[PDB]
């Protein structure tokens, strides 16, 4: 005997949720980077004007 159904299920469940959280974090960082790029460009433009 090596495992039991509920324990195996919870194994799988934990792994799934881990992947889900990492995906969410990636999305957030992506949006932040985009906004920073935009603001940088605009401010340098105004200074030159």
């Amino acid at each position: 005997s090596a495992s039991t159904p509920e324990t195996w299920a919870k194994f799988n469940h934990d792994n799934l949720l881990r992947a889900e959280r990492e995906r969410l974090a990636s999305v957030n960082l992506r949006k932040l980077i985009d906004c920073i790029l935009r603001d940088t460009a605009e401010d340098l433009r105004l200074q030159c004007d």
Binding site: S1, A2, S3, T7, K10, F11, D14
Partner: protein, 52 residues
């Protein structure tokens, strides 16, 4: 009757706490707004002017 013990290679849940005596976090933590050179740059001259 006992093999989960050999199957302990991969932690099902556990992450826990490890053991270190070398924290030395990467030298950088957050940013600081720098500032420029007092006064203006000076480079090079060809001929100059005088009242004697």
């Amino acid at each position: 009757m006992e093999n989960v013990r050999r199957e302990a290679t991969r932690p099902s849940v556990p992450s826990g706490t490890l053991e270190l005596y070398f924290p030395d976090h990467l030298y950088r933590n957050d940013y600081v707004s720098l500032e420029g050179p007092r006064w203006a740059p000076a480079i090079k001259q060809a001929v100059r002017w005088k009242f004697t």
